Amino acid sequence: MNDVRNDDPNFNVMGNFDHGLTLALSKGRILKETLPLLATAGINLLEDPEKSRKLIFPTTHKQVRILILRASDVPTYVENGAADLGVAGKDVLMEHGAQHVYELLDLQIAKCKLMTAGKVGMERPKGRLKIATKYVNLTRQYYASLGEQVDVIKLYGSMELAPLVGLGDYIVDVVDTGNTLRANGLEPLEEICKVSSRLIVNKASFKRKQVLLNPIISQLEQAVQSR
Amino acid sequence: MNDVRNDDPNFNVMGNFDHGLTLALSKGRILKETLPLLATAGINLLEDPEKSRKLIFPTTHKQVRILILRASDVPTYVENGAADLGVAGKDVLMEHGAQHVYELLDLQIAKCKLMTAGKVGMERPKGRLKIATKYVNLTRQYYASLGEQVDVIKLYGSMELAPLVGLGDYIVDVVDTGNTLRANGLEPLEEICKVSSRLIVNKASFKRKQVLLNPIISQLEQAVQSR
């Protein structure tokens, strides 16, 4: 009837296989820093997603639905065109791989550095180094950069915990300030590369839904005044 | 040879490389159902770990510290002897396929069935089926059992979401009641195996710290209404 792109009724206005627009967001501190930029494109959630039973959220904009995903899955969904576009840390994107996707924007949010780390005042142990990390490939590639080989240990949860209980000799995680690190008696060591949230678009979706995407991108671009 | 074993100091003792005992627990519905049985063995936390900034919890026993891990990491820690023993879903244990570990106890808690699932009135697709799943190997092995080969899509988070947004043809997840499934218009389909939380012990840890372990195991065994 009205088709006002202001969709205020929450608990409603959510069709499935949306051939409007499907946005995949990394839950947690990325989301917090993401929404401000979405805010300044007239795109906002309509309940606390943390306190919501929904898996698919409708938004203030009627042509846009949101997924709150584990960071690792965001590129997975967009790669496959489940999601038309998404917001993922460069760390995740680089580790996961960039396939059927365009990386359109450095959003300059959830900015941090992929770093090695150890127990404060630690002595490099002797054999193959044991490295606890979510970012296996990136760690494997980074020590390959230094012509070293390492034993990797894949972790999904707290990387902070590993070295305290003597799981890793070292860890590789993303580091904002490394205050949390110091507070748990750890130290950031070697910067592997800089990291920030990046906007990605399924290549197909990008060709197909150009009408919807252009304006949103434009507004997101402007929301970042990094000039 | 000291005699004190009890400890009510919370935010105390704990510390690093405990050559007492290190217990790795899964963080979800498992934990809730786990602690009662630990209670029975005189092993209990002394604060809400959910509301604690602490990473390593001390317990009622001075010889026992606790880690609350993502289910996926528990076998990782015990495999490596970071943790002396742990509690993980058979699903995770089978998928991870840990090495240096004894599976000593079916705790018959967080019981459920690893199942395939589809959209309500799903259409058998054509060609090689896309399966969204956390449990890649177990899915790969299970369709290998039926002599079919499938395209797997690894997920870390909610597998429930995939088919709604048309990611998978089907999904493989654990199904305790599968109410959540029916709620967003999905169906349980088949049964790949039955699943429950299991107690696991690093083989080395078992040899070395047998004096501490035997008592706990014994009491945990009995706490499952053993006959």
CB B194 within 8 A of CB B106: no
Backbone angles phi, psi at A36, to 5 degrees: -45, -45
Among the partner-chain residues B17, B22, B73, the one whose CB lies closest to the CB of A155 is B73
Selected residue of B21, B73, B95, B151 to mutate for chain A interface (largest A Cβ count, 10 A): B73
**B177 Cβ contact partners less than 8 Å away, ≥ 6 residues apart:** none
B-chain CB neighbours of A22 within 8 Å are 165
What token pair was written down for A151? 């034993």
> What is d(CA B189, CA B48) in angstroms, rounded to the nearest whole number?
38
* Beta bridge partners of residue B119, listed in sequence order: B186
Residue of A nearest to B167 (CA): A82
Q: What share of chain A is helix, strand, coil (3-state, %, to 5)?
A: 30, 30, 40
> What is d(CA B71, CA A5) in angstroms, rounded to the nearest whole number?
41
Q: For the beta carbon of residue B42, count every other beta carbon within 10 angstroms.
A: 15
What token pair was written down for B55? 């990473």
Considering only CA atoms, which of B64, B67, B65, B107 is closest in space to residue B89?
Answer: B107
Check residue B62 and give left, alpha or beta (phi > 0: left; psi -120 to 50: alpha): alpha
Selected residues 142-161 of chain A with any CB under 8 Å from a CB in chain B: 153-158, 160-161
- Chain B: nearest CA to A210, how far in angstroms? 20
Q: For the beta carbon of residue A50, count every other beta carbon within 10 angstroms.
A: 9
Among the partner-chain residues A76, A154, A184, the one whose CB lies closest to the CB of B155 is A76
Among the partner-chain residues A55, A72, A162, the one whose CB lies closest to the CB of B164 is A55
Selected residues 49-68 of chain B with any CB under 8 Å from a CB in chain A: 55-56, 67
A-chain CB neighbours of B55 within 8 Å are 158, 160-161, 164, 184
**Is A82 within 8 Å of B16 when comparing Cβ atoms?**
no
Among the partner-chain residues B56, B156, B184, the one whose CB lies closest to the CB of A165 is B56
Burial B211-222 (b: 16+ CB within 10 A, else e): ebbeebbebbee
Q: For the beta carbon of residue A3, count every other beta carbon within 10 angstroms.
A: 7
Backbone angles phi, psi at B195, to 5 degrees: -140, 140
Among the partner-chain residues B55, B160, B166, the one whose CB lies closest to the CB of A161 is B55
Q: For the beta carbon of residue A173, count every other beta carbon within 10 angstroms.
A: 25
Q: From which experimental method does this structure derive?
A: X-ray
Q: Coil, strand or helix: which one is A196?
A: coil
Fold of A112-195: D-Maltodextrin-Binding Protein; domain 2 (3.40.190)
Check residue A106 and give left, alpha or beta (phi > 0: left; psi -120 to 50: alpha): beta
Q: Is the dihedral of CA A27, B185, B109, B145 positive or negative?
A: negative
CB A34 within 8 A of CB A197: yes
Query: How far, in whole angstroms, is CA A65 from its chain's centroid?
Result: 18
Please count the CA atoms within 13 angstroms of the CA of A53 that sit on its side-chain side: 5
> What is d(CA B81, CA A192) in angstroms, rounded to the nearest whole number?
28
CB A77 within 8 A of CB B165: yes
Q: What is the 3-state secondary structure (H, E, C) of chain B?
A: CCCCCECCCCCCCCCCCCCCCEEEEECCHHHHHHHHHHHHCCCCCCCCCCCCCCCEEECCECCCEEEEECHHHHHHHHHCCCCCEEEEEHHHHHHHCCCCEEEEEECCCCCEEEEEEEECCCCCCCCCCEEEECCHHHHHHHHHHCCCCCEEEECCCCCCCHHHCCCCCEEEEEECCCHHHHHCCEEECCCCEEECEEEEEEHHHHHHCHHHHHHHHHHHHHHCCCC
Check residue A155 and give left, alpha or beta (phi > 0: left; psi -120 to 50: alpha): beta
> What is d(CA A13, CA A46) in angstroms, rounded to the nearest whole number?
12
Burial B49-83 (b: 16+ CB within 10 A, else e): beeeeeebbbbbbbbbbbbbbbbbbbbbbbbbbbb
> What is d(CA B61, CA B105) in angstroms, rounded to the nearest whole number?
21
> What is d(CA A100, CA A102) in angstroms, rounded to the nearest whole number?
7
> What is d(CA A66, CA A59) in angstroms, rounded to the nearest whole number?
7
B180 vs A: CB within 8 A: no
The kind and range of the H/E element at A222 are: helix A210-223
CB A89 within 8 A of CB A30: yes
> What is d(CA A4, CA B197) in angstroms, rounded to the nearest whole number?
50
**Is A73 within 8 Å of B166 when comparing Cβ atoms?**
no
> What is d(CA B123, CA B100) in angstroms, rounded to the nearest whole number?
43
**A64 Cβ contact partners less than 8 Å away, ≥ 6 residues apart:** A20, A21, A23, A43, A212, A216
- Chain A: nearest CA to B184, how far in angstroms? 9
Considering only CA atoms, which of B59, B54, B27, B17 is closest in space to residue B41?
Answer: B59
B69 vs A: CB within 8 A: yes
> What is d(CA A101, CA A75) in angstroms, rounded to the nearest whole number?
8
What token pair was written down for A38? 């979405």
**B197 Cβ contact partners less than 8 Å away, ≥ 6 residues apart:** B26, B30, B33, B34, B87, B88, B89, B90, B107, B109, B110
Q: How far is CA B189 from CA A193, B104, B178, in A?
A: 45, 31, 11
CB B205 within 8 A of CB B85: yes
A70 vs B: CB within 8 A: yes
Burial A199-208 (b: 16+ CB within 10 A, else e): bbbbeebbee
B169 vs A: CB within 8 A: no
